[PDB]
């Protein structure tokens, strides 16, 4: 509309209405110029055997993008508590996005002193990739999302993508994308932008823990009418072979017939937080579970959803089977264990095999008068008819959705880092500053213009999500476990700022507190 | 409308709908001040015999102009592929042009440091020459067109024209044009400009190759009922004259009667890309085919459409009979052969004579008992009744249309560099910055003001063309030749940017892949 009028307002809050909760977040952003308005080809710079798994080919673009795909973007710690203590499940419904109060600044630097002024006629370009025609980078747990704390101003991350590569070289099948070749809306300082999005139907995330285990579903007072083989020999001696059968009952619950079995496993190596218990060797990469694709090895991370550890042992964690978050101010490389937060999937032990254990045993031969029965350990087990399992939990710091790859087939497309898998997830929102050239020469030149005015933009983003709730119906008599704050005195309030104004998140918070019968 | 509102959006894409394809391109431009707001008379500065062919007289203007007349302005490489593999022909239908988001910048340079600021009250003037009253420069294969890659910012070329000249002097018949003497629209930063244009009916470009040759149209199993003269003598000796006649048939297809003959020729000198095969002398200009007009010699370039070379010989090319494009970053003068891309017209061999060959032989005398039959080579042949020919192909880098000169007569007005000839082509679009004078003296002076504020403008151009398609109907059993990318690994993707952000076009791409029966 105009230079002196505001194109939007600040909306941050949650509205709890019945079975719906509506969250709204507003943040202030800053967008630089990336790559000097250039598309640039990029590839791994390394050589040798080590480079092999790390090889890539792709492009970086002048564009930035908006990422709201973490939960702490949309929920305060109190709202997340209010969610996870009272509800058995939740899921996103609608999405509403706004971009407003756009300001374009020009920077003239002379003799080491820089001046910043408004450029009132400059534009910023924005479009959403509604047709999912661009490579989709939002499901890779990247940085650059809206900050959890509403008072922080954040920088918009640069967009880039990878295409097919052989080592660091490309192939004829590799694709190049100009983002200028999409239609986009152009905004001066009075203009604003919005769009709305509709989540496709997904299952409720299961924010509850089971109060029964898959192997304990029987009535503890009654026998089965099934029999099992109790004895193959009468005793010590020669030629003692016999067949004896017993009823499965309360005394022996391990041999009873069951209708359902625990879910699939891919074994992880077990690491202790007590370092003297670990082996004195480097086994981080060498001893890691991995999968290979076209010759390259990828770590299995986090992998299939499995219980992090056995009951009573919390000092162990899967080598690359858990999500690990950094504490506030944690460095990038080779930080100690107290600098990171290792989450655990202990709640899913009821239906899921432990990550660091074998699935079970199988017979490896035929026993005979000349051959003893032999067994072997099942290190990995794929889906069997009759398996039941839980997905990975979601966290306040963790991702919300992922894009399901477009393929002939998939199974249980729920994404492995947690959250909601979608064939049409929330679309990517691309933004860049329109280049403003400096003064051209006075005689014509056919070369493209490499001289521009140094420029950046800033503004406000609001995002609104409607969430559907699934309320707890339980008949449990005794009280539940709840997520709660601790009363003990401390130098800081958790989930607040410190004396320097730095907001931190003390610990990762999962979703599973309330219980359900298995 | 306003300073803080945007006057247009960014539209780039193609829409393939049935028999129509609609392309839309948006670019960012920069317009300087040319000639210090002056019209200036210009003429060749050279003297001597060499100057004769190069003599000219004309004017340069303060105005710039917009040129979208190359195909890579409107088509991406993938769209051009999608066009040429699937279609027998195409042609333009409608045109829509927009000019928006205008910014005028003033440059104040003090002590070697220059400041750039917005001048919000300045205007830019624009008009289209709808009545074709200006000299038309768009059909001369000039530089300054919108860049093929949408992310590049381009400088607008300066407008100028030539009028009648005798050497470097003018004549009374020479015309002068003030472009200020047209009505034009004036635009401040909130204003925008548009117009729409309707292509006049042109034939479809023939984007196909013939799967038959003009001389092979007979049924290979059957004789003709026509006779030809097989023998004029019985054998060796004296007085052996006779007349013998044979049937033309499968055994001798060269002597058969035919209804149609190949098209016209003007012979070109043949040059090899293997330099040891070429003569050790300078023959580029001296050995070139030319035409003379009013005493001046013009190279025949590219000339009539003729097959570039005989089958099996691709190392030869016509001396000035082909279009030659430069590779990205190629210098202006005396570049090597690997720096340029020589296109070929090998597809049209079926109906057209080879450029470097004679058309044929004619009888030069009357044979008699005292005189042997004599023949001579036809170096150039004009139109004959019964000729058929193909036009020159169009390229992704090549021109789209030309203006047919306004004359009493023309023949097959299709332009010789390729594309669509039109009596009313897309009009010229002229643009200049309105001069803003600096402070005048405080006492009156009648001289025109020579002191101005240094100023330039920038903005966005979008152009939209609707193209009509002619779909391939063929009954051919075996598969076609298609244009395709090569799978082999390379350091760069073709038709992409490199690591420095430079977009290049690897090779020229013609239109002729699908085949038709002759």
């Amino acid at each position, epitope marked *: 509309d105009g230079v002196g009028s505001s194109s939007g307002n600040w909306h941050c809050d949650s509205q709890w209405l019945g079975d719906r909760v509506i969250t709204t977040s507003t943040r202030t952003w800053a967008l630089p110029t990336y790559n000097n308005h250039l598309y640039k080809q990029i590839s791994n*710079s390394t*050589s*040798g055997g080590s480079s092999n798994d790390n090889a890539y080919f792709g492009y970086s673009t002048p564009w930035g993008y908006f990422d709201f795909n973490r939960f702490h973007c949309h929920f305060s710690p109190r709202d997340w508590q209010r969610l996870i203590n009272n509800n058995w499940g939740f899921r996103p419904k609608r999405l509403n996005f706004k971009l407003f109060n756009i300001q374009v600044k020009e920077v003239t630097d002379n003799n080491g002193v820089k001046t910043i002024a408004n450029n009132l006629t400059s534009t910023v370009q924005v479009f959403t990739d509604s047709d999912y025609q661009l490579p989709y980078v939002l499901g890779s747990a990247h940085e650059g999302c809206l900050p959890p704390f509403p008072a922080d101003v954040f920088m918009i991350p640069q967009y880039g993508y990878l295409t097919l590569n052989d*080592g660091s070289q490309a192939v004829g099948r590799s694709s190049f994308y100009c983002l200028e070749y999409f239609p986009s809306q152009m905004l001066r300082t009075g203009n604003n932008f919005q769009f709305s999005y509709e989540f496709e139907n997904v299952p409720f995330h299961s924010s509850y823990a089971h109060s029964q285990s898959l192997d304990r579903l029987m009535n503890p007072l009654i026998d089965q009418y099934l029999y099992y083989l109790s004895k193959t020999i009468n005793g010590s001696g020669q030629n003692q072979q016999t067949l004896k059968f017993s009823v499965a009952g309360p005394s022996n619950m391990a041999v009873q017939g069951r209708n359902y079995i625990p879910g699939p496993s891919y074994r992880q190596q077990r690491v202790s937080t007590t370092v003297t218990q670990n082996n004195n060797s480097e086994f981080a990469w060498p001893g890691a579970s991995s999968w290979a694709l076209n010759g390259r090895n990828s770590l299995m991370n986090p992998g299939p959803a499995m219980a992090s550890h056995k009951e009573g042992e919390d000092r162990f964690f899967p080598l690359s089977g858990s999500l690990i978050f950094g504490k506030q101010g944690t460095g990038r490389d080779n930080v100690d264990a107290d600098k990171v937060m290792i989450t655990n999937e202990e709640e899913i032990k009821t239906t899921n095999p432990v990550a660091t254990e074998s699935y079970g045993q199988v017979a490896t031969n035929h026993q005979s008068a000349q051959a003893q029965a032999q067994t072997g350990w099942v290190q990995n087990q794929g889906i069997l008819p009759g398996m039941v399992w839980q997905d990975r939990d979601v966290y306040l710091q963790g991702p919300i959705w992922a894009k399901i790859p477009h393929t002939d087939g998939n199974f249980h497309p729920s994404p492995l880092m947690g959250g909601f898998g979608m064939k049409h997830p929330p679309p990517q929102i691309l933004i860049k500053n329109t280049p403003v050239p400096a003064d051209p020469p006075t005689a014509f030149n056919k070369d493209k213009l490499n001289s521009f005015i140094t420029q950046y933009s800033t503004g406000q983003v609001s995002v609104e999500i409607e969430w559907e709730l699934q309320k707890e119906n339980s008949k449990r008599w005794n009280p539940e476990i709840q997520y709660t704050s601790n009363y003990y005195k401390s130098n800081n309030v958790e989930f607040a700022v410190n004396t320097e104004g730095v907001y931190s998140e003390p610990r990762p918070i999962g979703t599973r507190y309330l219980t359900r019968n298995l | 409308d306003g300073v803080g509102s945007s006057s247009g959006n960014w539209h780039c894409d193609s829409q393939w709908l049935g028999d129509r394809v609609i392309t839309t391109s948006t670019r960012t431009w920069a317009l300087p001040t040319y000639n210090n707001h002056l019209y200036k008379q210009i003429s060749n500065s050279t003297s001597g015999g060499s100057s004769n062919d190069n003599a000219y007289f004309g004017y340069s203007t303060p105005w710039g102009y917009f040129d979208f007349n190359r195909f890579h302005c409107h088509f991406s490489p993938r769209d051009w592929q999608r066009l040429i593999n699937n279609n027998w022909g195409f042609r333009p239908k409608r045109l829509n042009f927009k000019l928006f988001n205008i910014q005028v910048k003033e440059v104040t340079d003090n002590n070697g440091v220059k400041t750039i600021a917005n001048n919000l009250t300045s205007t830019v003037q624009v008009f289209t020459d709808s009545d074709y009253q200006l000299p038309y420069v768009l059909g001369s294969a000039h530089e300054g067109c919108l860049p093929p890659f949408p992310a590049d910012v381009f400088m607008i070329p300066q407008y100028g024209y030539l009028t009648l000249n005798d050497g470097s002097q003018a004549v009374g018949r020479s015309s002068f044009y003030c472009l200020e003497y047209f009505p034009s629209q004036m635009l401040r930063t909130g204003n925008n400009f548009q117009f729409s244009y309707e292509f006049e009916n042109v034939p479809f470009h023939s984007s196909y190759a013939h799967s038959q040759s003009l001389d092979r149209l007979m049924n290979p199993l059957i004789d003709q009922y026509l006779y030809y003269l097989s023998k004029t003598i019985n054998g060796s000796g004296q007085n052996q004259q006779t007349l013998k006649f044979s049937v033309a048939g499968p055994s001798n297809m060269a002597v058969q009667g035919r209804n149609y003959i190949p098209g016209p020729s003007y012979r070109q000198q043949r040059v090899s890309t293997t330099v040891t095969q070429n003569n050790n002398s300078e023959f580029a200009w001296p050995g070139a085919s030319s035409w003379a007009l009013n005493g001046r010699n013009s190279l025949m370039n590219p000339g009539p459409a003729m097959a570039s070379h005989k089958e099996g010989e691709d190392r030869f090319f016509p001396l000035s009979g082909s279009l030659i494009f430069g590779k990205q970053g190629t210098g202006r003068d005396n570049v090597d052969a690997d720096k340029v891309m020589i296109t070929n017209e090998e597809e049209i061999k079926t109906t057209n004579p080879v450029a470097t060959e004679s058309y044929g032989q004619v009888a030069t005398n009357h044979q008699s008992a005292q005189a042997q039959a004599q023949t001579g080579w036809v170096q150039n042949q004009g139109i004959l009744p019964g000729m058929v020919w193909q036009d020159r192909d169009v390229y992704l880098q090549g021109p789209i249309w030309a203006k047919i000169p306004h004359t009493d007569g023309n023949f097959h007005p299709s332009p010789l560099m390729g594309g669509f000839g039109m009596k009313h082509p897309p009009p010229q679009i002229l643009i200049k910055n309105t001069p803003v004078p600096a402070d005048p003296p405080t006492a009156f002076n009648k001289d025109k003001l020579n002191s101005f504020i240094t100023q330039y403008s920038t903005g966005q151009v979008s152009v939209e063309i609707e193209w009509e398609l002619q779909k391939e109907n063929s009954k051919r059993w075996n598969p076609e030749i298609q244009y395709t990318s090569n799978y082999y690994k390379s350091n760069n993707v073709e038709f992409a940017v490199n*690591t420095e952000g430079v977009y290049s076009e690897p090779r020229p791409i013609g239109t002729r892949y699908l085949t038709r029966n002759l």
Partner: antibody
Amino acid sequence: EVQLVESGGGLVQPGGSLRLSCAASGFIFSNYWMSWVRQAPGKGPEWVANIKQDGSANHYVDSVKGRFTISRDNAKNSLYLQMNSLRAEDTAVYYCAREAYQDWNYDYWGQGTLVTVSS
Amino acid sequence: DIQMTQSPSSLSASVGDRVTVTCRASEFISRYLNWYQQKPGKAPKVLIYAASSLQSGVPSRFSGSGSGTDFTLTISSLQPEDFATYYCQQSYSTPYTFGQGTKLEIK
């Protein structure tokens, strides 16, 4: 089939600068990483530098960092090693090698040129 | 960087004998280990690359085994042509490093 030729070897006083050129006729030169390997007299060979198949990146051994520049011309299929501030230790036979695709070993080696740094 | 240690530094055997050379790596270099045979006045020639795999055109008597930090070069049915200096090189990371070398002697 695949041939690598090294030229420019010779004797130079310390602090001197020398340039070495490698010619490759047998393969697609732009698909491969190329290395420089030196073997001092009576010693095992030693890796000096490698450069990317397009020349975007390059690596050098610590001892020679800043004094040597590896360079690649893909159109001429030639590899160049630029040596500055030469030392007595530097004198060795210089080998031009091609790094194998995927495996990364030196599948092909040039004959090599002896380069002497003498007082 | 990574250090490569080759043992024994020198070895002497006779035609028909079985010879084994051991290479050790300071850090994990996976399967990227090569064995080069070198004769005076010539460049090193690759015998075995990527741990186990044998170079084409090389006799089947040369064999290689091992992964991670320990590798071994095995020669069965030794031949007069086999006497040379042998190097183990790691191509896992830069700077690429070579072993000290094992020299074989006629007996």
